[PDB]
Amino acid sequence: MQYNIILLVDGSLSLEQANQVNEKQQQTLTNVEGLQTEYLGLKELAYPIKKQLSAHYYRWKFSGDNQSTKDFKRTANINKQVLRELIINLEREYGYLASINPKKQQLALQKRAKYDEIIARENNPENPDVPVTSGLASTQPRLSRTEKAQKPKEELWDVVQKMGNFDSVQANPYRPRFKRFNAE
């Protein structure tokens, strides 16, 4: 699998914390792939936990077997230098199969490009953008659909016998009943 930890180390000193993260990484993770690490920075987290107001956020994008979680999970709490820890297994988050499909990825790039074009005209440099068309409806249908529209699997069948067919056609419904008026 592909995991992603968001570790919460205390706010002591930068250089020594990075060492704490390397220590927390190299002890556990029995079997692992490449462990790329970043460093989002220093932020003042919202609610004070462990009586600390500053913390260093580390993100790990390693990958490995299911056993890589157990030892790390039971050791994080014991270590006084870690405030919280979340193992977000990204193979179960709300939407991953669509993200691996290549065709859906290119559409997202195209949607980004086209949407950026619309926002630009609206927030025009100084000239007034009269249409201000965004949330509103679009123009006539897309001719792309009209043509590339699917065709039902038209199973082709061949006639073998016949009898009595004459296609008379009696499509004259709700016709007039009365015909010509008369006097007794």
Binding site: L40, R59, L83, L86, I88, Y94, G95, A98, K111, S134
Partner: protein
Amino acid sequence: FKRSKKYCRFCAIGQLRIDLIDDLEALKRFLSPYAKINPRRITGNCQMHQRHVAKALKRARYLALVPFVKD
């Protein structure tokens, strides 16, 4: 008066995925002034996205990134 501009952003962009450290400033818009997940009438996303963002923001609210009851 009102507006009909209540429309899911992520649809026009096809973001297809919500991660709390990719559009963090975006999620603060969905939240209320008192750190609450605004409903559809205010937030504007389609139900499918509204569920995905809700899980991510509460996950963010568990990882201690956004307040609970105050600003």
